Amino acid sequence: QVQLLAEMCILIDENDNKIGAETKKNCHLNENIEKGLLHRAFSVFLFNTENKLLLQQRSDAKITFPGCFTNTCCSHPLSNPAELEESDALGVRRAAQRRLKAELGIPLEEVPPEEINYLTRIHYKAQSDGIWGEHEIDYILLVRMNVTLNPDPNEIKSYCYVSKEELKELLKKAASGEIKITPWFKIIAATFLFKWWDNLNHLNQFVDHEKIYRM
Ligand SMILES: [Cl-]
Ligand SMILES: [Cl-]
Ligand SMILES: [Cl-]
Ligand SMILES: [Cl-]
Ligand SMILES: [Cl-]
Ligand SMILES: [Cl-]
Ligand SMILES: [Cl-]
Ligand SMILES: [Cl-]
Ligand SMILES: [Cl-]
Ligand SMILES: [Cl-]
Ligand SMILES: [Mn+2]
Ligand SMILES: [Mn+2]
Ligand SMILES: [Mn+2]
Ligand SMILES: [Mn+2]
Ligand SMILES: [Mn+2]
Ligand SMILES: [Mn+2]
Ligand SMILES: [Mn+2]
Ligand SMILES: [Mn+2]
Ligand code: NA
Ligand code: NA
DSSP states (O other): OOOSSOOEEEEEOTTOOEEEEEEHHHHTBHHHHTTTOOEEEEEEEEEOTTOOEEEEEEOTTOSSSTTOEESSEEEOOBSSHHHHOOGGGHHHHHHHHHHHHHHHOOOGGGSOGGGSEEEEEEEEEEEOSSSBEEEEEEEEEEEEOOOOOOOOTTTEEEEEEEOHHHHHHHHHHHHTTSSOBOHHHHHHHHHTHHHHHTTTTOOGGGOOSSOEEEO
């Protein structure tokens, strides 16, 4: 069940400069996060062609945030030449295509890197339990397209396309404890998500490849 070699994450400084690599496990231990260990990540927000946002629910088997709802795909570029590539954020866009297939079963041809749009970067920290957490500079990637979903149940328990109002209702259910959402998704929904969603045809104003936002 466990792979022979551990997956590697890209270690970065607070300015998103590559400074090394560490195992996925080590990158997500609270004890290391508290020493400042920070890694590169991405977060895909995919909208269908009626502007419904695609949410995933993480499988109960995931190490961090099992069973939690979040946006379309939250994962990491690998520490290899393909995904280390920083020109036009190609590395993270390639990573996103890779994980859209692995997690949601979306064929590669449906989401080529060229159609994955890099908006901005957000630096955040979160805790999952007593052992595990998150600490990332997260590339925000936006997609609007109809895709064919066949998730790997080992990765994804369910998915849901939500309108703005449906999301608002879902967040109410999370607040009452009826369902679980990741700390990332909670904070992004509270800060930027609806601003982007109200402006899907005018996103250029939100493109910022210089400033790294903090939340
Ligand atoms: Cl992990
Ligand atoms: Cl460390
Ligand atoms: Cl809309
Ligand atoms: Cl494919
Ligand atoms: Cl384009
Ligand atoms: Cl489903
Ligand atoms: Cl909540
Ligand atoms: Cl999170
Ligand atoms: Cl629209
Ligand atoms: Cl604009
Ligand atoms: Mn567990
Ligand atoms: Mn995915
Ligand atoms: Mn993240
Ligand atoms: Mn380059
Ligand atoms: Mn936090
Ligand atoms: Mn930090
Ligand atoms: Mn991470
Ligand atoms: Mn959660
Ligand atoms: Na499913
Ligand atoms: Na608009």
